[PDB]
Amino acid sequence: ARLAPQAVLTPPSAASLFLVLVAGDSDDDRATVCDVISGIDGPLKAVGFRELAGSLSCVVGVGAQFWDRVSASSKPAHLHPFVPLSGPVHSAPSTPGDLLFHIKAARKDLCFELGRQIVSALGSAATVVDEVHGFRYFDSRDLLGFVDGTENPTDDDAADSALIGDEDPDFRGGSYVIVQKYLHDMSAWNTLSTEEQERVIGRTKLENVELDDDAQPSNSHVTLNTIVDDDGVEHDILRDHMAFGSLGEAEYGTYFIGYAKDPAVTELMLRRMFLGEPPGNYDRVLDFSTAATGTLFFVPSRDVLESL
Amino acid sequence: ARLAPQAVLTPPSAASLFLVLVAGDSDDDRATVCDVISGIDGPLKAVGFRELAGSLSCVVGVGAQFWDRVSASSKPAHLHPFVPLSGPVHSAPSTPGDLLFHIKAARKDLCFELGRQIVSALGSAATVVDEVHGFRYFDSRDLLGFVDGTENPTDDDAADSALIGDEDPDFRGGSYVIVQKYLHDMSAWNTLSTEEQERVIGRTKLENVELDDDAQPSNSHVTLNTIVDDDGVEHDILRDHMAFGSLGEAEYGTYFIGYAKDPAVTELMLRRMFLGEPPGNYDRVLDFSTAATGTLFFVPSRDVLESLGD
Amino acid sequence: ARLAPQAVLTPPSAASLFLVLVAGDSDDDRATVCDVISGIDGPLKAVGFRELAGSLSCVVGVGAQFWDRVSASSKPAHLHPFVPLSGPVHSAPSTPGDLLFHIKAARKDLCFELGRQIVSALGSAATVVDEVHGFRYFDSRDLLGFVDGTENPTDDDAADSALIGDEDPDFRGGSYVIVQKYLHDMSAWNTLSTEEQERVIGRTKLENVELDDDAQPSNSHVTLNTIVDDDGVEHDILRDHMAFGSLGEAEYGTYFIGYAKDPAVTELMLRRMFLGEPPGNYDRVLDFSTAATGTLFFVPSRDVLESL
Amino acid sequence: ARLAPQAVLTPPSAASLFLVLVAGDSDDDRATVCDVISGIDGPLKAVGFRELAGSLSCVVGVGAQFWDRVSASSKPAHLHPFVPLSGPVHSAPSTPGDLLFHIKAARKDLCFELGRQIVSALGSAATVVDEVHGFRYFDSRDLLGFVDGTENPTDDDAADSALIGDEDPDFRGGSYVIVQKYLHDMSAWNTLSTEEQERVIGRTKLENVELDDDAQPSNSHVTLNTIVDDDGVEHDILRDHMAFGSLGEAEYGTYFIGYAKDPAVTELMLRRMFLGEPPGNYDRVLDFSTAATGTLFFVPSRDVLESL
Amino acid sequence: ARLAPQAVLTPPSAASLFLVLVAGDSDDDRATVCDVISGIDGPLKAVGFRELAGSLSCVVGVGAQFWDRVSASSKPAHLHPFVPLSGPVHSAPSTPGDLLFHIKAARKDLCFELGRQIVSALGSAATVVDEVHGFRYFDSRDLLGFVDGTENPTDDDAADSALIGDEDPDFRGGSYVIVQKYLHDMSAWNTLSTEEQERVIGRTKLENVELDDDAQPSNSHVTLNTIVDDDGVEHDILRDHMAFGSLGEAEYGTYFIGYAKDPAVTELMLRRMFLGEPPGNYDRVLDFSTAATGTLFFVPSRDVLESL
Amino acid sequence: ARLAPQAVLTPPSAASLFLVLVAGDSDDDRATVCDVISGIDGPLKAVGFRELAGSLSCVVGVGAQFWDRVSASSKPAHLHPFVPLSGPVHSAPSTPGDLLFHIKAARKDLCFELGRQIVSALGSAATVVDEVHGFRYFDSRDLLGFVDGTENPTDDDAADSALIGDEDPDFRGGSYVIVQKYLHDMSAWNTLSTEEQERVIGRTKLENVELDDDAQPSNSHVTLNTIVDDDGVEHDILRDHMAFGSLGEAEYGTYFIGYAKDPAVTELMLRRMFLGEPPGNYDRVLDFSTAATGTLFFVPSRDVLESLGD
């Protein structure tokens, strides 16, 4: 997929832009927004074509509520606003957003330029409500210093995990994407030893190897995020984390973004993380990371997107 | 597709070579030509294997006349010579060519060496009548200074636009390619202002953003080259422009090359360009660009290519 | 084919590692081996995910004997051990191996690190019986100075040539691989003129252009390794040579690895080379190269491998 | 210069970090700050050594006031706080800063990591007061769309322009650096035609060619920033602009940074820009760009820096 | 040596452009030419600054006749026109040129664009009399298939060899350059065996290893081009060949460019090649290469050039 | 410095080759050896010219014994065999070698091919006694998992540290290089925790940050290898480590190579490491790393190198 919108399956990139917008309550607003995101390949190629590599991609997400404003029937099976979580200790807020632009390329400028054109076409019809500029941090690490995104599926595995789906054939090729902007408590995290940190995560730190079953804490992040159903089938999401931050504001962040053919999978992971399994046995990553956003979007296929 | 001939759908490259040749009249000539082209997979790997990235590609095109010498039996549905167009001030000549090699690579030497080995194999069985060494100019601009190749289809849209399907199943996976070598009038073009240039093209110059409907002249190159049928169904082609030129001769060029599943789409684009729509409302790019060549070729799929003549 | 085990079709690489191992007889060995190899994309992802480019790949092969010890249930049609060849002047030995790891990447460190993790995870359950650290030598040459790999099938051709096959539905997507470690007599080779070396190979040395029919000796490496059936159809294999060696030991090597959906094609090339066509008219490449190893492995699809 | 602090002469980079800090009024503050910036190569190599290319560099600037707190004699000839400007229409503010870290590398992460280590070593002894993450925008353009930094001197030209100087031999190898964070009025600027924009700048837009003398407006940026003395000697600075911004905050910026052996040159340019020459005939770039900062720092040589 | 005119010492490049021009006789011509060439780093920076890598370079040469028309004041010691050579079988013509632009970069577009700007700035004041678009051919080979440029001096050696010179203080830092455009007879060349071609050159073809003393013919290109003085000191030049050509015209070329602090060294190589050592024993490279041009230019230092 | 031999100051590379050889006893042997090494500029260009970046470099080192066979006249100030050290549990053997080739490039094949042509020229006039194919391991870490090479001097500091100056003007621009091939005990080392490993080294593991004075053991590798004279003047060396190993043999290595203007600086580092400071307070890296070789060589400047023997 070179220069196509809704390229959910792209590998990771040196640079990302996450733009989250709310739509004008007006009628003229709903119409410009629709006509801009439905002609999204225009600016995608307008920027992207200037780089020989063609690394630029753009996935458009539309939140449940705005989807209702532009389409009666049909609606995809699982589109709903992001479900908030109130855990023993930690909370995942559900925050506003009608549009997501998830932008990737090999260079920052390519990203920024696509974002500039998008934001400009929208004018006063929409309002930026969250904006992260992500960046690869050494060998795909997060600011907690672990290699992050490892066990992502790929090739056929990834298409079955992320993309609808004979099960909902009107929206075949689409996906459900959840975003969460996490901020970290660096100083707290740095008071753990490497080994404690590894126990919190589920893998070794430098060498990025999974801890043995007989050594792998039942509340480790890896454990809480493994999903096996009754039949013993595993269910995976496609994740695309990036680091971001501000030195002066002491803000160090991980931007979570996860794609799935069914958001039941992503939501189950989030429940096991915030509420624990067994209940109360929650993910220690949450002791060091706080989600400031939580938004759920439908990712239309190219065809479905182009028709709005 | 890596080191396979007839890879129509390859992304743009840093360097290209376009060779157009005319075949000899004899029966020797025609059979040498069929050997070289049906076994083009050989020189392609002989050269291209030597570069780890395997960027080298080579698409072979056969003209309508030569096709009749080789396979009178069985002609693809729309293969004919290039249709010359002739407007009041600007014309699109129909110039000779039996063979097209459209070569792309990340490096000049690979393009050159492949060309060299091909030309060497043909020997006196063919003559080069056009040769262009193309090169990427800045951020994929053409010598007029505009980003060029932008609205080209990609992925599935591209395959559908460019390759013969069910409509002509005997030649599924082939294409029709048209080439034209254009020369520009740089000082004429430089007397225009940016804003005027933008009105000629249909997009802003630096930022490559499409002009909105209301600012978009009916004879902008973009407007004229938009093909929408009565059904309201859009028809695209796959274009592959490269810059070329010579500073001493004051030649500044764009080499045009368009692939289509049906050349009717390309031919209509050319009519709207040269004859205008409504009539006489022609494409002002042509005020600054003169076509020195125009030739149509059939691009056989690999299976078909391997069978000539034989 | 990003970070998938059994990516047989991958292109040449700047670096590769070839590991051959024998398993222990203990049932516990039997089981360690099967754990590690069936979970192979754990380490493949543990390591490979640290490279932005994702160039790392790892193909696992399993020997006939070892397959039997683990799945007397079903066998792939052509899984037998490597057949030794004993020819008028030169011979191809049949040497041990239960496991092949064919590892490739853009960098040595990735190859070495994947190997480190595999070997170490197999612990005393297995023993490295041959180890070759291969490298790209100039413009895809081998140490005899010829561009080597030129006539490999690509894309569809390659899949047809290398992957099973309606002809064996239970092992669809797998392959058979034969390795042979060759050592060259450099000084002898250098007494030939370039033209002589060209006559041995079947192609020109610098330009890598195939010699025409009337100047192609009938025992050139190329003629011998052309396999055309009675209907005039050509049967190809997918090959992956790398250079290797040691300056002080005066070892200058070519590691041969050949993939095919039916190893009989490979095996036939080997016979025409070693014994000759017609018999006695053998590949003069063998006057300057000696096979120190010869082993055949079955390459399972991901599904079959994941379930061993 | 690989991995040396005070590498004023480095070429431009894909990524930059500009950090401006104020020092604690305390005594313990003055001491940690001194010992951190005087051991600045420690973290420079600590981060920089992890990249094969070694593209990371770090220039440290110390403002006049803090310089006084740590050194009586000696003081460089021209160190003083940045002079504010009140022009016919436009104003250059003079804003706080004791320390500048001007950081460059081929990757964002390298920059951010160096900044993280610096800010962390400083702890509560200093406070970030300005922070820009710059990025190359296409072919060295600024967000106004012009190629920017063209006429920079280089090689010997650049060392004579930027570096002291037999004229002040205690501080030979040092430099004076002025920074200004500009924000742009994109919408206003976009209402000019290309040709007007070119007249404002002094060069053509796409092709980056200098306008002819007989066509070059006397109030163009190029004109106002050409410095010839009585004898007709030209005086140049070394400039190292980067773009930065925020889509949601509609902030589009150019970060100015200019190095000179004598700040008289930079200040004269700034006077001709804000006040005009003839007076009132000012730089139209200022009609579209507003400076939010203005700070002047001394850039000690390596030797002078290491001794504090 | 970043974006400086008269960067004689730069390494090989992937692309280059060689422009030779004759000036008109009008005094206005005289002056246009001198404006453009003395301001040459204007365009060099206009173009070159757009590439992050800064690989673009441009060396200006000036012919003897044209120098006279512009500076009868002082002349560099060795500035005379190219001396034709007329030998037993082959001749080197002396062809016109007043200006040389030797342009190099990592990409053709940079070369072409610098050329476009120069030629266009010279307008009708000058005429391009020869134009070669040179390219790197595989591993630094020329179209005869040999690695070509191997024995170039580097670093200090190169400066000693190419740059004037206490021996001519007024033109310290300049050089003399000789260009010759060669066309090859490819078919004739291919009738030689590789060994014969090696005997012609003086080195092995694929491995680029120098033939040992007893197998080096006395008329090999290498022997002939070895210049050793009476004290046994070797005098070298700095060379910059590129391949060029046209497939349809069957033109396969090597563009020779040679730099030296004293052109007599270059000139002597030329004599030993064309006329032979001993006389008649001439460079058999000339049986397969014909010089279509031959011109000598003086290469001013930046200071001298900037003041013409 | 591009394609010049004896480029001591080159930056780290992706690949290296370290060859150590012993010369034959004859007079033929010694003169072949002097031909090959004094004209090493030839193979260096023969190989290295073929790569556009010109990353290839080759530094030649001559042992003290062989130096006496070639230039009894005139010996540089500090040239002697490697001084073996012998502590209670860990030793630094002094192992044979007359010749060192320290080869660096961006690619393995260039290193290999240069080695091949050198070894081929020497013929039976020399024997390889050690050979290591080094490789960059992740973000310049060594097999112990730590970033390694960090505090190496750069620029002028480097030149001053590594090259002979006024002190020995007959050999200005030369150096003294010491090599040791270390083998690691990976399972011993893996039983430690990160924090302990950090205490062994003197820096944090992932982030490569120096530990502060108060957390910094007196026998950390970093502490022991800091050389400060009574004047309070620091003395550094130029180090060039590469990883190497073989998975089947369970060999995991660090190849050490240090350059100094005076080998006294390197030798003292080794004493503090092996014999400890205060005495017995040795470098715990040595609990996990065993030296299999130790050899000292003089690195002649180019001018000096060109003159042997002759």
Ligand code: HEM
């Ligand atoms: C600050 C937020 C987060 C940090 C720092 C973090 C970090 C990690 C790390 C270090 C790993 C192990 C490497 C890998 O296999 O990718 C991991 C794995 C994983 N993470 Fe998280 N993560 C975060 C948020 C989440 C959230 C919110 C979800 C679910 C909605 C999640 C889903 C997963 C999954 C599914 C895996 C792979 C588990 C497996 O199959 O081994 N991540 N992440």
Ligand code: HEM
């Ligand atoms: C020392 C070991 C070997 C060396 C140096 C060697 C070298 C070559 C060279 C130089 C070519 C021509 C370029 C190309 O198409 O790759 C070639 C072709 C070939 N080689 Fe070999 N080879 C070796 C072993 C083998 C073995 C053992 C087999 C079969 C099991 C083999 C199968 C082939 C095939 C199938 C081709 C393509 C022939 C064609 O054009 O159809 N190679 N090899």
Ligand code: HEM
């Ligand atoms: C928003 C702020 C600014 C923008 C967008 C801007 C943009 C430009 C552009 C487009 C050029 C022509 C290309 C070049 O030669 O670099 C230029 C040149 C120049 N600029 Fe500015 N600039 C800005 C601020 C300044 C400031 C504050 C100074 C002085 C303190 C300055 C000093 C120069 C100098 C010395 C030149 C080269 C003049 C010559 O010799 O041709 N820049 N800048």
Ligand code: HEM
């Ligand atoms: C068609 C034109 C030419 C071709 C194909 C050619 C080819 C070669 C080749 C293959 C080498 C050996 C590798 C090397 O050191 O570069 C060489 C060396 C050399 N060439 Fe030529 N050359 C040509 C013209 C010339 C001319 C006209 C000169 C002198 C004006 C010349 C001067 C040299 C020098 C100085 C060397 C190095 C000799 C040495 O080892 O000392 N080249 N050239």
Ligand SMILES: [Cl-]
């Ligand atoms: Cl961005």
Ligand SMILES: [Cl-]
């Ligand atoms: Cl070409």
Ligand SMILES: [Cl-]
């Ligand atoms: Cl390896």
Ligand SMILES: [Cl-]
């Ligand atoms: Cl940053």
Ligand SMILES: [Cl-]
């Ligand atoms: Cl050019």
Ligand SMILES: [Cl-]
């Ligand atoms: Cl090696």
